Each structure stands twice: as structure tokens, then as C-alpha cells.
Amino acid sequence: KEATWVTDKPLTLKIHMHFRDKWVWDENWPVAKESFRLTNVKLQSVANKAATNSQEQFNLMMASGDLPDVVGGDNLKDKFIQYGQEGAFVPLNKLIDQYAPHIKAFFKSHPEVERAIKAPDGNIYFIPYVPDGVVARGYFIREDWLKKLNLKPPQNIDELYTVLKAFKEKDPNGNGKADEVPFIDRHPDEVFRLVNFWGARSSGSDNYMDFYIDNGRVKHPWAETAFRDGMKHVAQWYKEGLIDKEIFTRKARAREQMFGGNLGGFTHDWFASTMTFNEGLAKTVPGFKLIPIAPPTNSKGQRWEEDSRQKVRPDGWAITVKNKNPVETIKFFDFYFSRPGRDISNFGVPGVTYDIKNGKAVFKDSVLKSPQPVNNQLYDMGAQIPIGFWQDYDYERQWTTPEAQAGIDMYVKGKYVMPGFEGVNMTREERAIYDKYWADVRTYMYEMGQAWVMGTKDVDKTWDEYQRQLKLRGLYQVLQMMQQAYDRQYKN
Amino acid sequence: MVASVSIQNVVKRYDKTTVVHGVSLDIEPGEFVVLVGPSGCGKSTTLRMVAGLEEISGGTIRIDGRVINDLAPKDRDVAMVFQNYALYPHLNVRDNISFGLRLKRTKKSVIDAAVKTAADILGLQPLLERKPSDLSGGQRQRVAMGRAIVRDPKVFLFDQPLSNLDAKLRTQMRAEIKRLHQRLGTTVIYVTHDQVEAMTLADRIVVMRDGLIEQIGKPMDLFLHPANTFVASFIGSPPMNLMPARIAVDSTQHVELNGGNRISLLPRAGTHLAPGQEVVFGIRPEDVTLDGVEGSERAQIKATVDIVEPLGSESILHATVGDHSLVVKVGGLNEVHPGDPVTLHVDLTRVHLFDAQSQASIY
Amino acid sequence: MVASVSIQNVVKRYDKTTVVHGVSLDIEPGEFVVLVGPSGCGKSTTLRMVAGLEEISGGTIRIDGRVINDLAPKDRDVAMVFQNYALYPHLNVRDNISFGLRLKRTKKSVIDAAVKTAADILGLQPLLERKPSDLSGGQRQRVAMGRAIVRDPKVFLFDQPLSNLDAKLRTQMRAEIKRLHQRLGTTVIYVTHDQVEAMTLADRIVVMRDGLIEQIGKPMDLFLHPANTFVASFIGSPPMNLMPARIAVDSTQHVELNGGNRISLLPRAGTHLAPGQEVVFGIRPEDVTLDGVEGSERAQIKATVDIVEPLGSESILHATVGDHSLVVKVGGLNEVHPGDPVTLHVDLTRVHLFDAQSQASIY
Amino acid sequence: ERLWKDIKRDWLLYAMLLPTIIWFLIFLYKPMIGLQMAFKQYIGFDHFVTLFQSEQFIRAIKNTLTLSGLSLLFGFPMPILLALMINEVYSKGYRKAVQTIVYLPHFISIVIVAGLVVTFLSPSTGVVNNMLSWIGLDRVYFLTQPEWFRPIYISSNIWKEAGFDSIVYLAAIMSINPALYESAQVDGATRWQMITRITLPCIVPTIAVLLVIRLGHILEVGFEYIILLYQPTTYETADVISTYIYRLGLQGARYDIATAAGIFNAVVALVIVLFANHMSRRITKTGV
Amino acid sequence: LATPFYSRSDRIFGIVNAVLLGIFALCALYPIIYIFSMSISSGAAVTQGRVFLLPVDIDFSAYGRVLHDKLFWTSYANTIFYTVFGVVTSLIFIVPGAYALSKPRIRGRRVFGFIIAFTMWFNAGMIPFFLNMRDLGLLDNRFGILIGFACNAFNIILMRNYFESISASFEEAARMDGANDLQILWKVYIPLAKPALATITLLCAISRWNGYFWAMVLLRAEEKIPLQVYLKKTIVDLNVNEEFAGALLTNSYSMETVVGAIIVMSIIPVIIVYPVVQKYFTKGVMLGGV
Numbered sequence A: 001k002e003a004t005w006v007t008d009k010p011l012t013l014k015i016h017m018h019f020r021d022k023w024v025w026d027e028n029w030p031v032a033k034e035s036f037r038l039t040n041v042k043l044q045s046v047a048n049k050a051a052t053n054s055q056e057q058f059n060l061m062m063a064s065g066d067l068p069d070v071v072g073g074d075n076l077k078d079k080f081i082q083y084g085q086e087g088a089f090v091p092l093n094k095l096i097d098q099y100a101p102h103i104k105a106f107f108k109s110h111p112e113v114e115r116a117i118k119a120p121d122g123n124i125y126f127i128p129y130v131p132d133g134v135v136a137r138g139y140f141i142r143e144d145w146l147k148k149l150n151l152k153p154p155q156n157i158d159e160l161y162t163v164l165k166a167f168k169e170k171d172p173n174g175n176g177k178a179d180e181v182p183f184i185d186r187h188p189d190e191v192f193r194l195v196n197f198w199g200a201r202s203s204g205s206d207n208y209m210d211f212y213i214d215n216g217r218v219k220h221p222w223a224e225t226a227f228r229d230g231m232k233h234v235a236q237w238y239k240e241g242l243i244d245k246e247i248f249t250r251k252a253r254a255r256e257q258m259f260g261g262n263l264g265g266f267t268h269d270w271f272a273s274t275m276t277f278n279e280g281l282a283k284t285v286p287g288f289k290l291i292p293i294a295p296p297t298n299s300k301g302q303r304w305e306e307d308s309r310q311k312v313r314p315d316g317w318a319i320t321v322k323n324k325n326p327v328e329t330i331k332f333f334d335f336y337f338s339r340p341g342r343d344i345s346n347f348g349v350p351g352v353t354y355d356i357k358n359g360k361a362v363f364k365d366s367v368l369k370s371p372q373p374v375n376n377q378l379y380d381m382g383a384q385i386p387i388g389f390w391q392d393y394d395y396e397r398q399w400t401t402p403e404a405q406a407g408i409d410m411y412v413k414g415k416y417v418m419p420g421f422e423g424v425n426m427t428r429e430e431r432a433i434y435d436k437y438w439a440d441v442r443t444y445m446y447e448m449g450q451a452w453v454m455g456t457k458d459v460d461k462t463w464d465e466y467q468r469q470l471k472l473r474g475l476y477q478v479l480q481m482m483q484q485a486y487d488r489q490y491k492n
Numbered sequence B, C: 001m002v003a004s005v006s007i008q009n010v011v012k013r014y015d016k017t018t019v020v021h022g023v024s025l026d027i028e029p030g031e032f033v034v035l036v037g038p039s040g041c042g043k044s045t046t047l048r049m050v051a052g053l054e055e056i057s058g059g060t061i062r063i064d065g066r067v068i069n070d071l072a073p074k075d076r077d078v079a080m081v082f083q084n085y086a087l088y089p090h091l092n093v094r095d096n097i098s099f100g101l102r103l104k105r106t107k108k109s110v111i112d113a114a115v116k117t118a119a120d121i122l123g124l125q126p127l128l129e130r131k132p133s134d135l136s137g138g139q140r141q142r143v144a145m146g147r148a149i150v151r152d153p154k155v156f157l158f159d160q161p162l163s164n165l166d167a168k169l170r171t172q173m174r175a176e177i178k179r180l181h182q183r184l185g186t187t188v189i190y191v192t193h194d195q196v197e198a199m200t201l202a203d204r205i206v207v208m209r210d211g212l213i214e215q216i217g218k219p220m221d222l223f224l225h226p227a228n229t230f231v232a233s234f235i236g237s238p239p240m241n242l243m244p245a246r247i248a249v250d251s252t253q254h255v256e257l258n259g260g261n262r263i264s265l266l267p268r269a270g271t272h273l274a275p276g277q278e279v280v281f282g283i284r285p286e287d288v289t290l291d292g293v294e295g296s297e298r299a300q301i302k303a304t305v306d307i308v309e310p311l312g313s314e315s316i317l318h319a320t321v322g323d324h325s326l327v328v329k330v331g332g333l334n335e336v337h338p339g340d341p342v343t344l345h346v347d348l349t350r351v352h353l354f355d356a357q358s359q360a361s362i363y
Numbered sequence D: 001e002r003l004w005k006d007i008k009r010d011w012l013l014y015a016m017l018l019p020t021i022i023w024f025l026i027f028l029y030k031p032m033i034g035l036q037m038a039f040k041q042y043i044g045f046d047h048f049v050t051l052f053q054s055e056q057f058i059r060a061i062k063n064t065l066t067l068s069g070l071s072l073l074f075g076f077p078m079p080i081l082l083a084l085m086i087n088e089v090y091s092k093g094y095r096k097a098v099q100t101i102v103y104l105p106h107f108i109s110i111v112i113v114a115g116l117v118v119t120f121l122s123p124s125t126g127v128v129n130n131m132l133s134w135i136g137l138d139r140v141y142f143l144t145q146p147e148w149f150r151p152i153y154i155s156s157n158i159w160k161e162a163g164f165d166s167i168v169y170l171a172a173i174m175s176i177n178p179a180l181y182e183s184a185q186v187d188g189a190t191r192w193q194m195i196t197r198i199t200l201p202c203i204v205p206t207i208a209v210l211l212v213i214r215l216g217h218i219l220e221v222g223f224e225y226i227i228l229l230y231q232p233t234t235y236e237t238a239d240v241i242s243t244y245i246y247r248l249g250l251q252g253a254r255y256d257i258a259t260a261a262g263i264f265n266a267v268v269a270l271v272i273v274l275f276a277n278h279m280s281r282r283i284t285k286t287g288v
Numbered sequence E: 001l002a003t004p005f006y007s008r009s010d011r012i013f014g015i016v017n018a019v020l021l022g023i024f025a026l027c028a029l030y031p032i033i034y035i036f037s038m039s040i041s042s043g044a045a046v047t048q049g050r051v052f053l054l055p056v057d058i059d060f061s062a063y064g065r066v067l068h069d070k071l072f073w074t075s076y077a078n079t080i081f082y083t084v085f086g087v088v089t090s091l092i093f094i095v096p097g098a099y100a101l102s103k104p105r106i107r108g109r110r111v112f113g114f115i116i117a118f119t120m121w122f123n124a125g126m127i128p129f130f131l132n133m134r135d136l137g138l139l140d141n142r143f144g145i146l147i148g149f150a151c152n153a154f155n156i157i158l159m160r161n162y163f164e165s166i167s168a169s170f171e172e173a174a175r176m177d178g179a180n181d182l183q184i185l186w187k188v189y190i191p192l193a194k195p196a197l198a199t200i201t202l203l204c205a206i207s208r209w210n211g212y213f214w215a216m217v218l219l220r221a222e223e224k225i226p227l228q229v230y231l232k233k234t235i236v237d238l239n240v241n242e243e244f245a246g247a248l249l250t251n252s253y254s255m256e257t258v259v260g261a262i263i264v265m266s267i268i269p270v271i272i273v274y275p276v277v278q279k280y281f282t283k284g285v286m287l288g289g290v
């Protein structure tokens, strides 16, 4: 028996969790086994590990007719509300009130967090993932490649253009080849973010391809006519070879290839893990120094950093109607908002990943000295997964390097960070349009943008037909329906 | 065993058309009877009907007192030899012979005296252990006959047993069949596309053309007195010469031929010939001779030599009288040249006449 | 297109075998010569070597003065009729005959008149628009012969043309072949496994066993005077008896066989055989009779009847002398029956003897 | 009457035939009932117009027809050509090795073939772009380019199936009696004269049957390849009716319109194979 | 064919024929030896544009990566299971049914022959088939993958056609000796059917081994998944965890060498059993490896 046990008798449950098209839940995970020992509840995964797309697996499992107990994952928010209203997911509200003191206290201390996850009716069908921190993404560049090639770090778009051009033409590495690639990333969507250099937005928030608010009007960044001016130029960048050709494909293996193979000159990504490489691969690549830099001056004469870390991003897990044990499950979810739950979810497992020192959790030397980023270890260990756990920023502060912290402080002090888009509260009737249309619209936008970057299509030529297709796909219907909310919410 | 078999009005029909029509034959116990004829016909269908491999659409057939119309092939008390040798390649020779018997018990059947006697009759001591794959055709048909006799049935059914063997091997297996039937003596019905085997083996020959049963009788009865022009043409080592002919002024004493040839005929009461009657005159090649040997002068004929084919001590002479040609067996030892006219002497006793219309035997 | 063909010491080797060994035959222009023998020898291989379809491993073959060894079949001035259906199924008969000429195209008048003459010879005029899908076997062989004669070669090569046909069609097409040779008169080599076709068609018969040429000569030369026991066994409708025997006692006169039977021999000057010499005695079935020499002066052989095979006007009598058996041709009735003793009368002029070790005549 | 009497004898035969019939009635013909049912929900007959007017689906049947044409034209004769070429080979060992090598890729799995494609054609990785860089042809990203999809497809397809499909034709031309060729040799026919005037017209019915069988599945051509290697950029040219049916029906979970497209494709296939069988019947020897 | 040699145009024809066929053969063989060498080769060399035909510095580590994969071997076991029992369950339905369809005396010979053959030129569809798999309760089931397709009309009419090519004298003699139906089929017709049995079992084997689509569609549980599906994940999708991405620099094998190694280990049994099969089927001069 344990003090954290949510049940006296052992409870084994069927959980389907497929997230980020990478990992599936594993009951043999150290974090999962620890979770079972502490909560006396074992989560047995029913999923295809051989599967690729997570969203597809969610849709197929949902359309299968046979529902599991708990359903976890990322970007399921809209879907959680959709199938929540349809009765595939049980409202946790009274379950949270009665049986979940920690979650209730959290939602009491965080009304704005609770507001976003609420349905039109106001119910909460899922326990959300709540990332803790201030910033998210910032621009990084090779310090060594700025030296032997004799070029001062770029203060603007022109200097960055000349620097990347110098990376492609002149040899920054010295293998004697043009094989080096000026710009990379592990997220393909970042190839759009480059339009910030021309003063265009790739999104309104941390979530890619999201709406935003301009002077009291709801607008989508891609639908604007300032978007194609930037897209033309990033298509020019892709054409000159400044952007990785495989940027839409490569993904998770990017940084461990381009930087590992010493072919990358530039990246966006994140602070901590990008600065982890400087310590990690320093042995294999001798002259590698990656440094944080302020965002280059755009064509609008401004300093723009678009991505900001958002609270309660659309991740989490939910309880089905076939669960038959809502109490032990809402208690189980309540555990991850508790201190030990946050400990095992953020820091991995004690005696292995971390230890308890002076009322805090401190990572082992084995974890901190690892060349592989800590979070990447935790992912395989079953930690920092998009469950309903509350994230602890200290965990990130531990493996955050002084240079990384200096870069973060630089970005915060410089106020380069643009405000995040919270979203709006739509009623039952007006949300259906969003739910139905926005998926197809977003997918279409993604495909078109990808076609534009790779240069398979012409921006200016296909722009009109693109606009009309956006019109007949019900984009502006969702836009006007979003304004229908925002205008009622914010006034003066 | 020794048992009689009676076939009464047996008929088999395929859809609207009817292959066999009302075939009726009575077969004495231990009698050798051969069904002989062209390829398409119901002789094989008849044998198959006796075997039980094909259904009886009408009429009744029985062996001894048992009616076999409704029966199982296993209980039909008959054994059949096929044209395809019917032996399984994978099983051993001894195992092949013992196939049918292996279904009934084992051991106390003893199988030893049976296969010993069978293989001794067919004369194979070493072939007991062998495979059909590595044997010759004649040996395969022989051991097939061994499977037939190991059953010890009331009736032996042969369907064109050696079609595929060579003539050299065929005459041998023929003689062996004759000896076998002379030894055992069980009732046997035999089917052949060859006239020779029918003539040699059969106690009784039944000829079948596409249709019903054409004729029955002893081999010499069919050779001497053909029922029609077909039987006449079918039986013999050479085919019987059949050429068109007529009668003009005198009937019983005259028959006229194409090239201006005229033959005096023996009276032979029981004829009922007609003057002016269109007739097909037949004659055997052995019954035609050269010129003036014996004769004389009222049996002769005039022709022009077409070709001569020496066989041996004998020779085959093709002679053209009118627009048609008749064949005559001659001595191989005489010098004959093509293109020069020749006189042929026909035997008046062995001549045959048939009707152009009815086609039956007239003379 | 009348030309002689000389074959000198030809030998064909396949993977260290040498199927045919040093075969040498000279063929006069317009002569009909038949290669005949049992299966497996190089009779077909020789013909094919002349055709050019197979390579000559040694020796030379030539037509007239030209050596065709390194030549091509097209330029060899020869045409071949194969045994199996050499006509193309999609093309019509007229298209079949004109195929080879259509290969070089040119003047349509030539391929027209050529096929007209050919079809006039073989009676292929009505069949001109017909297709090989529906045809007789004999007709297929006829249009194949049409392929042969439309070439107008120096040599006609026939490889077992009548093998796939039936007995009736073999006997018919054989006469048609001889008749055909009377017209054109082109030099022709003919290959057969059948003795009959060889006897009838050939001006000269050459027998070949196991790649070796056994004997050459006229049909009557092989029939009357066989070089050895094999040639004696091969030619004739029945096989020559060929049974073991000895002499001792008197040498130049008497020879005794089997169970103590003794035969008096004609002087036959030039023989000088030895007494006690191991010998194989043989005689033809046509030269043995039943009691028909009316109290013969030479005291002929005695036997015991095995089986009787009624043929027709003649009949086949199997008679067993001691441990061996000889076959004798008899009349049509002749009661006999198996098991009763019988006296056989042998013709003293037609008797043959061979040696047991050396298989040659020696008599 | 008769049938009972025949059944009494054949009972252990019919007993053998029954389970197969049951299998076919269950796993095949029952989905046809479900086919008649999937027509209406969620009459009916209306979403056939949704198929009639769409910019996604009309280009799918467009590319289905296109891919059918290309696969026919380039793909179908290649095994016949391979068979003819192998047939003309001497030195049996050489022809043996050739047959081994050429028949081999058929046994390679389709996803392994696609893997070979994506591996070989990967930019600055695969051997193809490297060999192109060696000659100074620069580089090309193949799987992201809609222009290159079909050539890559049919090339990998002939690489995989040409030999194994050539086996049948090779057996067909070896079933011809030598006399037809030898009598032509005596007449002085050349090699090309023989392959044209006898070989081909003799093998015609075989290639005809194989042609109508090919036309049977011609609408489903390359489904499992396309379902694998088609990129969002190449979706335009790559998308085929079968792929549409899969993506909407199984993935997108829309059964109605996908099943309707299934009916369309199946009916058109049955019609085209009916006309194919008819024209291969009247003109050629027999048929199916 | 014949062996005249002789003529010139024919000589050149044959030579250029052998040359073209040779080139095509080399183009066919090239990818195999390539992926072999590359799988053996180092990740660095493969990355730089090195390798091609022969290996360079090799590695041998990528095979270590694929040998430590549990789902790979599990899926291999799944393919083995599906091939064996799938082929067996196929033969069980096919052979006796084709044997019954072969015999000329049947009442429904016509209509049953139609019932089978009709499935060739007309199919219900992908979705109605999947739905029929759903209500049969065969989803996410190995037996559902086995009995799901045990039968192709092609194999049935082929087995039937080969059965009909056998002389009826054997069956008839068996009936004469008292053998009835089944006992016949086992004792004579089946050992006579060995070539057709080999062809069918081969086609079914390669059908089960390389089967991908319906395997991935009808199966959910990862332990039931066949090698081809897992291959669809690793080989052609190429998307991977941060774990494997972090395992790139700590190893020195590339991802491409891992891929190549996987497809090598996948095609190895094929390369092993192929010469035996072809040796069995040719049995003479060429005629093919059917």
C-alpha cells in the first residue's frame, strides 16, 4: 500500500495513446511502472506501435466502434470537444470537484487555462497538458562559421541573406564541398516562419497555422496578402539552396544529422536542446559552437519573434463512456497534478533519472552529462509525454546551459516575443463550422504551402485560385464565426 | 470363374442424340467376343456400360442370374483393362497388382499364391519389385492384365488394350492374349479398332459402325460372307476391291464393268439379282490373278498397270481398269512394269456383289 | 533438279557419344533410297545432317560436286518433310505452301503458278482457302509435301512421313508417294521405322542399327539374301524364325535342330560349313507348309502346335519345336487346335543359316 | 429422379465442394450484399453526383485512365519482349543466370521495392543522384516532383514484374513444335523473319488472354505502390480511383461515397473486360 | 529452337540481343548488390556520396541495430505463421474443391463454376469487404487474416484444369477396385498433381509473405503485425523517435544503412529459397522458375 494509491485493489485499464506520430504508450516504461506503483493503477496500451500518423489512429480507433478506457494524445483538443459533445467522452466536472482536489485547485488558480479547454456547454472532457515556462523558440547560429568565413553576425535580413549565401557558395566547414545546408529545422512548419524576416506571420500562437488578433479583428496569417510576398522570397531561398530540401521530410533526425554531419549553418528550434549539442557533439565535431542570436531586423524595420510558450496547449487525455471506472481514473489524473505525479512525469524515475535533494528533484549526473537532450531521454522513458500532467520548469532549468539562459534572458529583455493567441469561446451551433471545415482548410493550406516552398507551383500565379479555393472551403466562414465570439468578448 | 453374360436391348443416350441403339448380344460362358469398328461408336460405351463406369439409360444386362443394371462396380464381379494402362506410377508393380485386393483384409488373403500364379502366367519373376515409371509399354499393359486377373472375376473387359504398342510388340501381346484366354478361359469381351486382332482372338466378332450393331459371327463367316459393303471393305489384310458395276442383257450370267470389261457369274441360288440394277462389285486381292495361269477366258478382265509394290516373296499390284482401280496380290518374284496393259483372272466363286442403294449383300 | 548425293564416313557426336559411326552411302540421281531400322539409331540424324539441321562432327557429305558441310540448309538445294505437321495454324493452305517463297517475296506470279502446279499435283486445289485447324492428317502431310515440291530442290528428304498416320492412310499415302516419285523423279532419301514402306517405295534399302549401317541393296536382295541374323529378322511381314541349331554327324548335307529334328540341305556350292559348328537355322513362314509336299523326299521337321491365329484367306500358325517356336503361314480353315502334334514341311531351297558368334551368313 | 441418385454416389465429392462454395458465398458474395447496402446511407444515388462534380475525384479517374494507358503501353509488351529475347539465347548456362536475375525481383516485396525507390532517389543520399552528380547532371528530388511519379512507377514495376510475367510467354513459345522453325530454316528464314511470321502469330492467343486479364484489373493498377510513395505535392498525378476509395473510405471513414466509387470502378471494369473478352473472342482463338 | 548458326544478320542479331539482355539483367541485379554493400557500408561513406557498387570502410553495426529490434523479429514470426498456416488453410479449401469441380458429373458444375469464376471479373469493393470483415468479428485477428483470403478463383481453376488433364482411367480403375471419392484423391490424384500443388503452394506462399495492405488494415495489435507492415513503418515512412535520432550519433551507422540492413534481413530468406524453387521448376532447358 502507498499514500498515493487512488485504489486499494489493483486496476488495469485499456489506454490508446498515439502522439506526435512518434511514440505510443508503453506499460513497461519506467515512468509508467512507477506510476502503477504509486497510483496502484496500471495503464495497458492498446495501440499500433507500427502505425505512423497519430491523428489517423485516433480517428480509426474512434470509428472502430470499440472504445478503450482512457484516450491520450496531442492536438486532440478540438476532437476532444467534438466527441465530448457527441457523448463519447464523460464530463469530468463533478468528478474533478468531488474526487480531484488538485485539478480543481489548479483550475481555480488558473481560470484562463480552464477557459480554453471548456466546451461550448462549458464541460471539461479531458485533462490537458500544461507546459510551464516563459519563452519557446529563438534563432540560433554557428559562431565558428561566422569567423573563418570572416562575416559579422547578421543584424538584419540582408546580412542574413549574404551570410547564408556565403554558407552555400563559400565553404564554411572546409570539407571542400558545397554540401553544406544554410538553414535547417526539425519542424517543417518553421520553413514558413522565415517570412517573419519579411514581416509576415506564420501563425498567431505556438500552435502552427493558428489565427490571431490584429487591432480587434480576427485574422489568419496565411490568408493575408502580405503572406505571399514572404512566401515568394522563402521559395527563392529554397530555390537557391539556402533551405534544406528535405525540411518537410527529415523532421526529428534533422539536428542530429545536419549539425552532426556539420552541414547546417542556421536553425530556429528551441533553446535548451539546441544548446545541448554544444556540449554533446563537441567531441565528434571539434569546432562546433552554436550560439543564440536576436531575431534579424525585418523589412518592416522591426524585431520579430513569433513563437511564445503557451499555457495549456491542446494536448492531454480523456475518459470514455466505456471506462466503467470514472472515479479511479479522475483520481489517477488528479495524481499527475500532485507533487509526486509531477515528479515522476517531469523528472523520470527516482534512483535512475533523478534523486530527491532538499525538497526538490535533481537529475542524475548520468542524465545531465548525456549528449542526447534530457527531454529526448524522458520521451523514451515515458516522461514529458502529452498526458494530463503539470510541467515543472525547474526540470528544464537544470539542463539549460548558461549560454542558453543568457539567450533566453536576452529574448525576454529584448521583448522580441510576440503575444500569444488564447482562442475564443464558441457556442454549440457556431463551433460545428470550425470543427468540420478547419481541418480540411488547414490541411489544404499545408499542402499548398509545401507546394510553394519546394517550387512545384508559382505563388503569384496560383494566388487568386488559392484565394477562391479558401473561399469555397469555408475558411472565412470559420473566421467570421470566430469574430462572432471575439467581438462579444473584447470590446473596449 | 466361368459365367455367361447377356446384354439385352442396352441403349445409352447423350442429350437429344443417341450413341448406341438397342444393342443386344448374348455371350456364352468362357466365350471370346470382340467388338470391332471405327473410332467414334458405342462399342467402348457398351464395354464401359458392362463395367459399370457408365450408366444404363435403357434395356437390361445381367451376368448369370445377377442383374448388374443397378449395382456397384466393386460388386459387378468384372475386371477391366484400359488403353492408358491404368496403372499408378507412384505405386510399386506388386503394389499395383495388389491395389484392389489391399482394400479387402490383408495377411490370410495370402496374396502370395495369387501374385505368384499371375506373374508366372505373364512370366515376370523379377518385375514383382519395380515401378511403372521405369518399365516399357508392353510390360505395363502386361502387368495391367495381371491386375485384371488377380481379381479373378466372372468377366474380362478389354478396351483397346494395346493401342499404343508397336506392331512388333502388338503381335506378341496378341499371341500372349490368345494363350492367356486358352489357358484360363474366363468369359471375356474385347474392344478393338484393329481388324487383325478381332480376326485372330475372337471366337465371335461383332462389328459396330457409328450406329447400332452391324453384324455378328465367326471371323471366317465375316470374311467369306460380309453383310454389306462396309464389312467387306473393313475386314482383310488388304481392303476388298470395291468398284461400281451394272447388269444389262442377261442377269445371272453377266456383270459389266467400267473399262468395257464383262464377267460371267456363277448361278449361286438364293441371289435374286436384277437386270439393269446398279451394283457395287467387290473382289478380294487374293482372288485376283495374272492372265492365263488356269482359268480360263470367261473369268478374265483387262487393265493397265498403275504401280507395283514388292512386299517380299509376294507383291502388291495396283491395276486400273476403268476410272477406278483394283488391287491384286501377285508373286514377288516376277518382273512387271508400269504403263503396259495386263489381263487379270478373277475367281468366280469368291466374288461379291452389293447394292448401290441398299448396300447389303446381293450375290 | 536431278542430282546425286555422296555421303562419306559421316559421324555425328553429341556430348561424347557418336550416335552414328562412319556412315557411308552413295546415292545416284533420281534414285529412291530408304534408311530403315529400329528406333534410336542415326537414321534421322543422318537425314538431318544432309538437311543441315544438325552439324557434321566428321566425314563429308556432298551434292553433285559441291560439299554442303559448311553450307546452309537454304543453299543446300534440299527440301524436307518432317513427321509432325509442318504447316502453320494461323495461315491457310495456300499461304502455307507459299511461305518459303514468300520469305524472299518478289514476283507474286511465281508464287502463284508454283502453288497452282503443286496443288494440281497433290489435289490441294479445293483446300487452298482451307485452314489447318480443320484438316485430315494425310491432307496435312500432303500440303507439307506441297511445301517440299514448291521448293523444287535437288533432293527430297522424308523423315518418317507416315508415322503419325493410321494403317489405312499409311497404305494409301505410301502408294501415293511411289506414284508421286514416278512423276517428278527427283533424288529422294526416305527414313522409316517400318519395313513395309522400305520394301515398297525404295529402289535401294539401307538398314541401320545403333548408328552403324548394317547392309545395303535392293529390297529383294535383303529379303532373299540377308547379310546377318538381324537383317533377316527385320524384313518381311512375319519375322523370320531364327532358332538355334547344330550339325555334327554329316556336315555338307544334314543340319539338325532342337529336339532331334533333322533337315537335309541343298548343296549350295561355295559354302563349306563345318560339322559340329554352332549355327542359327531360320526359314520364312511362307516357305513352311502343312503336309502339302505330298510325301516329301527330304523328311521335314516335326512340331507341336502352340496357338492358331485366323487372319483371313490365310492364317498364322504358331508351332513349337522343342524349347523354341517357329511361325508358319497356313490356309484359312485347317482344324489343328492346340495340343495335338503336327508335321511341318520345310522348303529346302529357301532355308537360311547364320553363325552364332559372327552373326553373318556363313551359308 | 436422377440428381438424388447421382448425389448418393457423389456425396463425398459434393462434400469436398461445399466448404469452398461456402467460403466464396461468405467472403466474396456477402460483401456484394453489403455493397448494395452501402449504396444508400448516409437512397441514395445522390453522392454519385458528388463524385460527378469534384476537383479531387475527377482528376483521380483522369490519372486512373492515364496510368492505365501508360501501364498498358509500356508495361504489357515488356514481358513478351523479354521472353522473345531469352528465347533467342544459346549457351544454356548464360540464359539460366539471366533468367535467375530477371525473375528474382518479383519475389521482392512491394514495400521493399518502394523502399528501394525512396532510398535510391533520396537527394544527396541515394545512389541515383550521386551517379547524376558524377556526370554533372546535378540533382533532382524525385518523389516530391509530380512529373517523375509515373516514370518511376512503371520503371520499378517492369524491374519487378517483367521477368516473372515473361515466364508464361517463354513457356508459350517453347510449346511450339520445332518442325515449324526447322522447315522455315530450310526455306532460309532469318531470326526476325521467324519471330515475326511464326512465333508471334502462334503466341497471339496467349497474349490475348493475358491482355484481357490485364484489362480486368487495369483500373486498379499500382494501387499498393501509390498508397505508399505518393507525396502531398504529387497527390495530383498519383491519385487513382482505388486510392481515392481507400483514403476516403478506410482512412477518412467515409463509406458511402467511397463504396459508390467502388461500384463505378467495378462496373466500368466489368464492362471493359466484357468488351475485351468479346473482341479477343471474335478475332482470336477462344478466350475466357 | 534450332542451332543452325550460319547466317550473318542472324549472328549480329543474336549478339546484340545477348548484349541488350545482358545490360537489362545487370540493371536488374544492381539494386540488390547495392543495398547489400550499402547495408554493410559505413553511414559516413553512404552519406558522403561514396559506396555505389562495392562497400568501403563497411560497418556491421546497422545489423546490430536491426537485431536489437523486438517488433522486427516479432513481425518476422508473424509472416512465418501467416505464410505456413495461410498456405495450409488455402490448400485445404482449394484442392478438394477443385477436385470436385474437375469431375464432369456434378449437378451444379455449371453454376458452381460460375459462382467461383465470377469473383475474378467483378469484386464488391475494398470498403464493403472491410465491413464484411468487421461484422464477421475477424478484425484484429490472425485467424481472420488466414481464413480471410484462403482462396483465389485462379488457383482453383488452375488446380481443376490440371486435375482434368489427368487421364480418367485412373479414377475409373479405382472405382472398379472399389475406391470411392476421397480415398481416390489421396492415393492417386494428389501425388499425380505434384507440379500443380507446387505452383499453387508457391503462389500462396509469396502471396502471404509479401502481403501488406489488408494485413495493415485488418490488424491493430502490434504483436499480430507482419514484417511488411513494420517495414511500411521503418523503410518507406522513415519517420522516427528522438531515441533513434539520438542513436544516430552514438553509433556511426546512418539511417540509410539501417534501412538497407533491414531490407537485407527481409529478403535473405527469399534469396535462400529461390534457387531451390527455380531448380525444381526448370528441370530441363529453361522453361522458367514458376
Ligand SMILES: O=C(O)C1=C[C@H](O)[C@H](O)[C@H](O[C@H]2[C@H](O)[C@H](O)[C@H](O[C@H]3[C@H](O)[C@H](O)[C@H](O[C@H]4[C@H](O)[C@H](O)[C@H](O)O[C@@H]4C(=O)O)O[C@@H]3C(=O)O)O[C@@H]2C(=O)O)O1
Residues within 6 Å of the ligand: A019, A020, A021, A055, A074, A075, A131, A208, A270, A271, A272, A273, A274, A313, A373, A375, A384, A396
Ligand atoms: O527541447 C526543448 O528545448 C524542449 C524543452 C521543454 O522541456 C519541452 O521538452 C519541449 O517540448 C517540445 C519539443 O521540443 C518539440 O518542440 C515539440 O514539437 C511537437 C509540437 O509541439 C507538436 O506536438 C507537434 O504535433 C504535430 C504532430 O506531430 C503531427 O504532425 C500533427 O499532424 O500536427 C502537429 C502539429 O503541431 O502540426 O509535434 C512536434 C514534435 O513532436 O515533433 O513540442 C514539444 C512541446 O512540449 O510542445 O521542448
